[PDB]
Design a protein around this nucleic acid. Structure first.
Ligand SMILES: [Zn+2]
Ligand SMILES: [Zn+2]
Lengths: 49, 208, 119, 194, 24, 168, 98, 219
RNA sequence: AUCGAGAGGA
DNA sequence: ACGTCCCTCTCGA
């Protein structure tokens, strides 16, 4: 117990996209690499205007 | 007594494989002559001195059939680890005045340029080293049986398979086995090896 | 070897021998200063390096919060409050024997049982 | 290994330390130079049984002479040999307190430091060079038992980390009709193109 | 990065004499 | 879970002991410098044989718990799609994640993550993801699994242009 | 990543003066042959001076930005094992909160 | 904060292990060969070979560090004072300018700082040796704390500075307000519009002004 | 249309 | 000295 600081929440190492993966702590890492750049080639409301 | 006996074996073993080559080339040696152990080798050759163990074998009666010009081969050794042109003139006149066909001279450590080897037509002489002769390469697991082809065995392969000289796989004059049989340019050879498929494939090679 | 320099030039000294009295002098080639040697040890190579196997461990050494603390006592004050670290001579072979350092009295002592290190 | 006693762990143990390539730098722990026409304290009993006052005191390591197990009487011997009678050399003994060799040249300040490095790297000891390490190991091999079938007698084989087959061929006690190296370029130079 | 560029470090590049600079 | 996971939780523990011995034994200079490799590499090469066979000989306890009416078992029993390593990584324990061949590196100050001790050779901080995909990795575990796969992607993508220049 | 941000660029002058007023010896009047435990200061790769006991220095500063007197993006560090202290008012550092 | 400066500094220890020719030299901006670490030390002002060794050694007991410092003293023992040092760098005083200016300028390029330029130089030869005696694992070129990144600001800073560059040498032509105004605009426009980050019209880190992605708000 | 840069598909 | 095959978009002289 020589702790200097403490992490806010460990889920903040996630990137911009890969934050949307449901339970990445239960998948192979190269699968989390795909859904990362795969949610970028999707469809949906990109803006309201 | 020191540890000179380790240098003593590493020349008897050479001597045997040096003489082994002479039978495979096409000369007259018996298996008991080469299998002559070092115990009988020291008794009749000691005190190890090399100018006593110079030999002269000569062609067999089978070799004179397809190699009818393979003549007298004289082989002399040297005691001096380094050899100059002064002793070479003493050796070249052995073959020159008696007019033999080929000669092989074993130096045991080093020779200088003093260069004169290709100057007795018709007689090119091979030069080997006890460092590479102590163990024989041709006994190895993956060195196939190279067999020399005659001048008529040659032009017979070139007619049956409808070839020109170039169109045949090649071995080079400095190839460790082309030295071991003293191959010249134009001579062919019939590598017979085991095969994972045919069981006995027979490849051919010419020498440059 | 821990040799010195001239006192008039502060330039290094190249040894020389007294060819008559048989003694060693530390000559100078900037000026002509001379002095006779202290020890006959002129050169040392030392191939298996051991100087610095605990390098860098001065004042506030039980402070760096990175290094955790052990629960074992020291050979004088016997404090179970003390830090530790591996050999800081980062060579490819040096063993993982751990050089303990005490927070309370600041002195080095190994756990190596094959021998017993002093530094 | 050789045909007969190839199941002999010890026959290869010597061949292990017969081509593993030793040099002075391997065993030497500290090389010092001194000016001393017989000063150094604990050297007085050794000197018991014309040159140059320049000393060369190199000290070996205990455990260094076990892993390859060299002999003090021979490590200095080929130091004594590689310079003819031009270097006055005598060593310690193997049951001593600390192993040390001393040499004298027979100005020469840096010119003895000349043979400071010359001894370290270019004076090999016990083995053939370029084979910078070996390691024996057992691997199973099928061979016909005299009853007729193929059976399971293993053997040993020294696996090197370097290739100079040119003269590891000719070492005694091995099988020079079998020795194999990955260097197919070196195999071509020694054994033939085929 | 842009705010600290336009505010300060944009003015620093003024070295018939150049002074304080305004951007609309 | 059915009382098989209960005993897979001890092989993950007993295999810590088999590497907890060679832990402080190696910092007592007792570790026999094996024929050739150094003291350091003798510990790594001896600890990964205890972690690889820990990971391996932890999932093959589950390969028998699943009855012949399991589906993913019926998938590898035919060979349709599945391996045994697929089962241990999902059910039992994923295992040691390795970058460039060896265990993880010390890109920091002789340590692995700014959450662990300095000068530490632990398996729980050198890439042994003890949890399974079912259970859920922890942020440390998840990260190493990351660097173990970056190596893969880098490979199967920036080493697939030489395979194809060899062919040409 | 999400909570990551990037340094913007701070000025080094109003802290290299805060050093000279708390135990910094510039290196023109510095020779190590009377002070070997001399810790070395660094600001953006500049060795400006020397200090003796960094104990209450690196912690009077670590609580100087925590109250706002020094910019929070400027990073402290002292390598105790090597007796050095680097300070970065740099522009381009990738700082995370904690 | 005022340039780019592509002039880097090299200091290398010659002679590998076993070579007793381990001379330390240094390659400097605008200078051909590698200068021994002593000649540059005297062109600085630190003269006696022996007085320079406190700038290198921060504890005169590392006798194994000072042993590698032997020959580099003799390698540059032929020059003895400050004048002779900077002539070997070649009226020929021009070396004092290069030393004062394009050399360790992350300190100041004013003269009178000749002591921080030396005490930094010795600190570099210092850190060089700790790796030669394996008291330090060579630094991590793939370490991320050692890496910086330029965002919009500093990227524009290079472009704005390199645009204002030849604007002021184009107003120097208005004599031999009616100055050029399109060049600052069309330059900022070009680089941010092509991706080839400006540099007149010769490309240079191409692919930095990418068009945005609008398929999903997440993307 | 042409060349030049950019993100992706297996 | 050349540095996988083919394919879909998008934009500046
Ligand atoms: Zn002097
Ligand atoms: Zn104590």
């Amino acid at each position: 117990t020589t702790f200097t600081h403490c992490e806010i929440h460990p889920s903040m190492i996630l990137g911009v996209a890969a934050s949307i993966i449901p339970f990445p702590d239960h998948n192979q890492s190269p699968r989390n690499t795909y859904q990362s750049a795969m949610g970028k080639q999707a469809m949906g409301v990109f803006l309201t205007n | 007594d020191q540890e000179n006996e380790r240098n003593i074996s590493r020349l008897w073993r050479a001597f045997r494989t040096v003489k082994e080559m002479v039978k495979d080339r096409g000369y007259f040696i018996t298996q008991e002559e080469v299998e002559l152990p070092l115990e009988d080798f020291k008794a009749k050759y000691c005190r190890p001195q090399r100018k006593m163990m110079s030999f002269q074998a000569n062609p067999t009666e089978e070799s004179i059939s397809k190699f009818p010009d393979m003549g007298s081969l004289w082989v002399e050794f040297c005691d001096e680890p380094s050899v100059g042109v002064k002793t070479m003139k003493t050796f070249v006149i052995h073959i020159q005045e008696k007019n033999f066909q080929t000669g092989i001279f074993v130096y045991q450590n080093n020779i200088t340029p003093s260069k004169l080897v290709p100057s007795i037509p018709p007689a090119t002489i091979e030069t080997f080293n006890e460092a590479a002769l102590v163990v024989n390469i041709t006994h190895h697991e993956l060195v196939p049986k190279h067999i020399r082809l005659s001048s008529d065995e040659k032009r017979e392969l070139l007619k049956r398979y409808r070839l020109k000289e170039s169109q045949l796989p090649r071995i080079q004059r400095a190839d460790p086995v082309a030295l071991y049989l003293g191959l010249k340019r134009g001579e062919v050879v019939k590598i017979i090896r085991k095969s994972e498929t045919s069981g006995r494939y027979a490849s051919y090679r010419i020498c440059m | 070897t821990t040799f010195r320099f001239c006192r008039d030039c502060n330039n290094m000294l190249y040894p020389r021998e007294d060819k008559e009295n048989n003694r060693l002098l530390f000559e100078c080639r900037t000026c002509s200063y001379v002095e006779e040697a202290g020890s006959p040890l002129v050169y040392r190579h030392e191939l298996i390096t051991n100087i610095g196997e605990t390098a860098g461990v001065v004042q506030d050494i039980g402070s760096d919060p990175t290094l955790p603390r052990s629960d074992r006592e020291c050979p004088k004050c016997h404090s179970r409050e003390n830090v530790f670290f591996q050999s800081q001579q980062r060579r490819k072979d040096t063993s993982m024997v751990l050089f303990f350092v005490c927070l309370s009295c600041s002195h080095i002592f190994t756990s190596d049982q094959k021998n017993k290190r002093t530094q | 290994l050789e045909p007969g006693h190839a199941a002999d762990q010890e026959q290869a143990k010597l061949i292990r330390s017969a081509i593993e390539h030793t040099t002075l730098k391997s065993v030497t722990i500290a090389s010092e130079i001194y000016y001393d026409p017989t000063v150094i304290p604990e050297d007085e009993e050794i000197i018991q049984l014309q040159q140059s006052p320049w000393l060369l005191r190199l000290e070996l390591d205990r455990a260094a002479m076990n892993d390859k197990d060299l002999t003090m009487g021979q490590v200095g011997e080929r130091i004594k040999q590689t310079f003819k009678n031009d270097l006055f050399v005598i060593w310690s003994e193997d049951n001593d307190e600390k192993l040390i060799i001393r040499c004298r040249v027979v100005e020469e300040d840096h010119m003895l430091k000349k043979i400071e490095n010359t001894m370290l790297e270019n004076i090999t000891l016990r083995g053939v060079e370029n084979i910078e390490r070996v390691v024996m190991m057992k691997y199973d091999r099928k061979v016909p038992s005299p009853t007729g079938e193929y059976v399971k007698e293993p053997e040993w084989v020294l696996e090197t980390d370097g290739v100079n087959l040119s003269e590891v061929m000719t070492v005694p006690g091995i099988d020079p009709t079998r020795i194999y190296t990955n260097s197919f370029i070196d195999i071509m130079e020694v054994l033939g193109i085929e | 990065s842009f705010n600290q560029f336009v505010d300060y470090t944009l003015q620093d590049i003024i070295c018939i004499s150049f002074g304080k600079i305004y951007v609309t | 879970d059915g009382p098989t996971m209960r005993e897979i939780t001890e092989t993950i523990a007993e295999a810590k002991k088999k590497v907890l011995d060679v832990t402080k034994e190696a910092q007592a200079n007792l570790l026999t410098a094996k024929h050739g490799m150094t003291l350091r590499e003798s510990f790594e090469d001896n600890v990964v044989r205890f972690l690889n066979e820990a990971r391996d000989k932890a999932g093959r306890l589950a390969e028998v718990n699943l009855k012949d009416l399991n589906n993913v078992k019926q998938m590898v029993m035919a060979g349709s799609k599945g391996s045994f390593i697929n089962i241990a990584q999902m059910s039992a324990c994923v295992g040691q994640q390795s970058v460039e061949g060896k265990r993880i590196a010390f890109g920091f100050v002789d340590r692995t993550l700014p959450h662990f001790s300095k000068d530490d050779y632990s398996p729980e901080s050198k890439g042994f993801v003890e949890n399974s995909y079912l259970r859920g990795l922890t942020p440390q575990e998840f990260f190493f699994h990351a660097m173990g796969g970056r190596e893969g992607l880098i490979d199967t993508a920036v080493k697939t242009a030489e395979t194809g220049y060899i062919q040409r | 990543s999400l909570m990551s941000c990037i340094s913007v660029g701070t000025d080094p002058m109003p802290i290299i003066t805060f050093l000279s007023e708390w135990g910094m010896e510039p290196l023109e009047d510095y020779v190590p042959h009377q002070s070997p435990d001399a810790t070395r200061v660094f600001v953006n790769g500049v060795w400006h001076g020397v200090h003796r006991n960094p104990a209450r220095l690196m912690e009077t500063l670590r609580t100087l930005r925590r109250k706002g007197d020094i910019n929070p993006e400027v990073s402290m560090i002292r390598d105790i094992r090597e007796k050095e202290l680097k300070i970065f008012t740099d522009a381009g550092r990738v700082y995370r909160p904690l | 904060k005022g340039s780019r400066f592509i002039s880097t500094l090299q200091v290398k220890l010659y002679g590998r292990e076993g070579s007793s020719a381990r001379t330390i030299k240094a390659t400097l901006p605008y200078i051909k060969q590698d200068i021994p670490i002593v000649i540059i030390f005297r062109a600085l002002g630190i003269i006696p070979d022996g007085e320079i060794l406190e700038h290198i050694c921060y504890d005169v007991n590392d006798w194994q560090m000072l042993e590698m410092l032997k020959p580099c003293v003799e390698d540059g023992f032929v020059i003895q004072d400050r004048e002779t040092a900077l002539d070997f760098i070649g009226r020929i005083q021009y070396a004092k300018d290069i030393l004062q200016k394009e050399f360790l300028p992350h300190i100041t390029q004013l003269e009178g700082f000749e002591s921080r330029k030396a005490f930094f130089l010795g600190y570099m030869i210092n850190r060089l040796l700790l790796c030669a005696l394996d008291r330090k694992d060579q630094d991590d070129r793939d370490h991320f704390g050692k890496k910086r990144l330029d965002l919009a600001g500093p990227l524009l800073a290079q472009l704005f500075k390199t645009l204002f560059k030849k604007l002021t040498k184009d107003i120097f032509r208005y004599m031999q307000l009616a100055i050029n105004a399109k060049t600052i605009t069309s330059g900022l426009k070009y680089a941010l519009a092509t991706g080839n980050w400006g540099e007149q019209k010769k490309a240079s880190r191409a692919g930095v002004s990418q068009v945005l992605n609008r398929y999903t708000y997440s993307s």
